[PDB]
Design a protein around this ligand. Structure first.
Ligand SMILES: CCNc1cc(C(=O)N[C@@H](Cc2ccccc2)[C@H](O)CN[C@@H](C)C(=O)NC2CCCCC2)cc(N2CCCC2=O)c1
Length: 373
């Protein structure tokens, strides 16, 4: 009953239905492995269909403390409190959890996204105002018998599944490969190698993780450190040089469009990210097709064409493996064993020539630690 419990619009996040308060108020909540605060719209806003009414909840408790959360995209401020929370299409449990009631925001809520709140699934270490504000998943595990693990299968309308407390074998094929959670704050991982159509970018592997690499369902793009970004774009340009695009396309400032049904997928390369294994000097790779990193932009005005944004972009805060990377993989956040597992999803991306893949093992001769710090 947890399969197909996520919905979304492309580029706008994936969300799960939740209830807050007593009697229960239903809200759609974006699933975010890149933050650790649970927060809901709690005042009218132009892009909110509905919001949390604390005055109607007899179980609401005010903590008399404000909070401010800035993301890469957007920011909000609100009042901290606690209340009862359920997940109708999740484990049938009720937990009392910290909730930030958002009362002001800037560029956070998205016109027509269908969600009214955000569920930060990462660790206390990055919660605001500080790590004493226990995150939702921690409360769920402490207060119920739910095992300390969840999995995400992310697939304009989109869908997928969040399996809370377990792994659903019907959602993936082949083997699950595990990479260590380096540090419990973000879901921090280590990238050891990057290839563009099988050609190594040939950088010191620390560059891939300058200054951290994270797995983030709340960010859309694959975001890369400047030096890695520039090298990657050069290589993708070279692979695709049968066609020439404006510089603005490569910067995400501009769409690329082709007559409907004629997108030349085959001129764009596959990107392989090699992730650190659980054993010394071993790795595995996840392979990303252009159908993942060229993100379709739905717009009836442009619909004689298929139009796309380049969904790899630059970062000054390390690698972000966003939703564009997670799509078509089954990703297991195995908190109990401090590891992240990847497998090919039941909704994997593939055409008649190429397929997304998770494969290993690979060995490196180079004994260098790829961690930046
Ligand atoms: C799905 C929306 N698309 C979209 C959202 C974000 C974004 O900032 N996502 C946040 C959630 C969200 C979801 C929806 C709306 C706003 C924010 C994540 O939480 C960000 N995760 C990390 C990187 C972070 O900044 N964590 C903070 C650290 C400080 C303490 C709080 C957590 C970024 C992009 N970007 C930015 C450039 C390229 C890209 O894809 C596109």
């Amino acid at each position: 009953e947890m399969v197909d419990n996520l919905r979304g619009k492309s580029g706008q996040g994936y969300y799960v239905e939740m209830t807050v308060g007593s009697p229960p108020q239903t809200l759609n909540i974006l699933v975010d492995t890149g933050s650790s605060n649970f927060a809901v719209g709690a005042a009218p806003h132009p892009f909110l269909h509905r919001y949390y009414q604390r005055q109607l909840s007899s179980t609401y408790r005010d903590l008399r403390k404000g909070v401010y959360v800035p993301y890469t995209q957007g920011k909000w401020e609100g009042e901290l409190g606690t209340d009862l929370v359920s997940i109708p299409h999740g484990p049938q449990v009720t937990v009392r959890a910290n909730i930030a009631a958002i009362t002001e925001s800037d560029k956070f809520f998205i016109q027509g996204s269908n969600w009214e709140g955000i569920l930060g699934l990462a660790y206390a270490e990055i919660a605001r105002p500080d790590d004493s504000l226990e995150p939702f998943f921690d409360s769920l595990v402490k207060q119920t018998h739910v095992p300390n693990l969840f999995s995400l299968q992310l697939c304009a309308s989109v869908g997928g599944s969040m399996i809370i407390g377990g792994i659903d074998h019907s959602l993936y094929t082949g083997s699950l490969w595990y990479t260590p959670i380096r540090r419990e704050w973000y879901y921090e991982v280590i990238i050891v190698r990057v290839e563009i159509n099988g050609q190594d970018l040939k950088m010191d592997c620390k560059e891939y993780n300058y200054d951290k690499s994270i797995v983030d369902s709340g960010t859309t793009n694959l975001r890369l450190p400047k030096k890695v970004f520039e090298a990657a774009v050069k290589s993708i340009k070279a692979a695709s040089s049968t066609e020439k695009f404006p510089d603005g396309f490569w910067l995400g400032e501009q769409l690329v469009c082709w007559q409907a049904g004629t997108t030349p997928w085959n001129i764009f390369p596959v990107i392989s990210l090699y992730l650190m294994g659980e054993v010394t000097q071993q790795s595995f790779r996840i392979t990303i097709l252009p159908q993942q990193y060229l993100r379709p932009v739905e717009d009836v005005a442009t619909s004689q064409d298929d139009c796309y944004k380049f969904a790899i972009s630059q970062s000054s805060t390390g690698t972000v493996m966003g939703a564009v990377i997670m799509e078509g993989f089954y990703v297991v956040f195995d908190r109990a064993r401090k590891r992240i597992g990847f497998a090919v999803s039941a909704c994997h991306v593939h055409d008649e020539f190429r397929t997304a893949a998770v494969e290993g093992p690979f060995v490196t001769l180079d004994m260098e630690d790829c961690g930046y710090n």
